[PDB]
Amino acid sequence: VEIX
Amino acid sequence: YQYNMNFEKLGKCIIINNKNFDKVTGMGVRNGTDKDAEALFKCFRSLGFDVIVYNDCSCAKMQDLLKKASEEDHTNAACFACILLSHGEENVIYGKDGVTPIKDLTAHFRGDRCKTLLEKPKLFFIQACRGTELDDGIQ
């Protein structure tokens, strides 16, 4: 999972 | 006690789906955002919104899109909805060319600047970061  | 929904249309729903960004911004590709936008498209379509999805918008593009919508005639609409999918930082959202303030995007729909949405709900949904803190959770 990544971050915006 | 409830907003009057007895109109011809539920209203317009703008989805801004920003995936790819100018390298000058230093921001990476937002993989998965297409799955978001499609799912959002179906849900809000199902609610009764007239949905349009715009992709990889510049700041001026985003500014123009919302400005134009505020100038449209919403007399037969119950409400307005806007969905923003992008990178961001506190109080601001990324276009492909850089950042623009969220307040500037939404101010177009103020009562004195959009009379046909007066006393009607104006909804903004924002999937974006708002800074760099993490939430460690507990228990």
Binding site: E2 | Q2, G32, L47, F124, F125
Partner: protein, 93 residues
Amino acid sequence: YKIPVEADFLFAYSTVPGYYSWRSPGRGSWFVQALCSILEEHGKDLEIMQILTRVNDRVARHFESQSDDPHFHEKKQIPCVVSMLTKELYFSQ
């Protein structure tokens, strides 16, 4: 007579101010996943604050990050609803 110019706005942010927001490349962002699930099964019969509150619950409970970087491992998220609404909002009837 008058109505405030800032009235009847609602902001459903995916996260609280100052914080990151999470996104799975395969399945989409946490907030949108939760929003769509809840809208799909209750969009027309629940009031918007009830909807977004359930979204808050699901994002808070059903989701937890995994990274190999320990700085980003096992992190959590809570969305943030800002309401200047003057009425209850149902998407039906």
